[PDB]
């Protein structure tokens, strides 16, 4: 492990995104950049890839693909493969699809064959960028020379963004919300999150868009990736699960000018509908975390407080527990996935309603971006406020929590508001 001092007057997010863009392009390698607690970790190059699909598990290393049949819990299949990765490298990175969370509710038969559940890789090199320093892990000579060449120059100018039209409704979001409202009125479930894709008619420069959007937002976590033909970036508004080496498990569900921002904060703390849903959600997180925790260790340590994320303020709680010796970090992720914010209440009913009333598979949207460590660590950020590119198609995706009182026009405008997090910050390629 070697170190380079962080150059003064340079923002870590900008430098990490520039390294991700230029260093990985010169050697033509895949990567994942993950921001977590002031640290930007760039996982560059694929030493080994774990592909978990609905019908198969693959481990691809040095041109060789090992295929495996799997049965039971997807977390057990993923965990066993990722633990083997972590015996050779200190950290592993990737993404978990929304579809990974359907098995706990017995809904996996509704998945088409070859449905992606997770993609986790061990990188060839890691570059950690923070305000204090740049730390290099397993960086070969060719990579160290590329990093020094990038550092001898200033970061690129971020060009002006290109606007996107989000006013159209080709997937019939308004109609699908009306169906959900009728189902809720009939007592089938209490809440469901429905969403819509918005096609971007031009190719996006992902690392430059990442930089422009990160200037205005201070999210819980962020990511930028180019992995297995998928380009993605996002500003995670929620921590699904964090597992520490000492056994502490955390989950932080959310639920919700200077004078205008203070008035919005006062409403966020007094809104009855938001308070009721938050209490139900906190109770759901507590019941779920108790199935993997040491008896009597589950507790709410921060209850209903505002967290400022720069351009967005959230009402949230922190649920903590100690991981039971009979459980593991993948079981903890399975117990807390999918998030209530990504599914609905009751969670099983919300997930089932999403199969019928949303464009499926969701893939990365409402899934998680993850960082795992050899000492047992896990960090999983909820994937919302994200942009994607897969084989010629570039798109955004945003949803809304639909309840009995929801109105289709109001909820369409609510997805328009969530889309505003990225739409003015899209840099064209
Ligand atoms: N319940 C609930 C809830 C609270 C906050 C956000 C969301 C939600 C659903 C989908 C999205 C999004 O796409 O950003 O955000 C859902």
Residue numbers in the entry: 15 to 270, 277 to 449
Quote the study's own text.
The salicylate synthase MbtI from Mycobacterium tuberculosis (Mtb, the etiological agent of TB) is the first enzyme involved in the biosynthesis of mycobactins. These small-molecule siderophores are capable of chelating iron, a key cofactor involved in several mycobacterium-specific biological processes. MbtI has been structurally and biochemically characterized;2 it is essential for the survival of Mtb under iron-deficient conditions, and, as such, it has been identified as a promising therapeutic target. MbtI belongs to the group of structurally homologous Mg2+-dependent menaquinone, siderophore, and tryptophan (MST) enzymes, which transform chorismate by rearrangement, to generate precursor molecules for the respective biosynthetic pathways.
A kinetic analysis confirmed 10 as a competitive inhibitor of MbtI, with a Ki value of 4.2 ± 0.8 μM. The adoption of this conformation is due to the fact that 10 does not possess a suitable functional group in the correct orientation to establish a H-bond with Gly270 or Thr271. An electron density compatible with the presence of the ligand is detectable in all four chains of the ASU, with the furan-2-carboxylic acid region always well-defined and weaker electron density for the phenyl portion. The analysis of the binding mode of the compound revealed the presence of H-bonds between its carboxylic group and Tyr385, Arg405, Gly419, and an ordered water molecule; the oxygen of the furan interacts with Arg405, while the phenyl ring forms a cation−π interaction with Lys438 and a van der Waals contact with Thr361. Finally, the cyano group forms a H-bond with Lys205, a key amino acid involved in the first step of the catalytic reaction. The main differences are related to the orientation of the side chain of Arg405, which was not predicted to interact with the ligand and the side chains of Thr271 and His334, which are shifted away from the binding site. As previously mentioned, the absence of interactions between the ligand with the amide group of Gly270 or the hydroxyl group of Thr271 seems to favor the outward movement of the backbone in the two mobile loops, thereby leading to an open conformation.
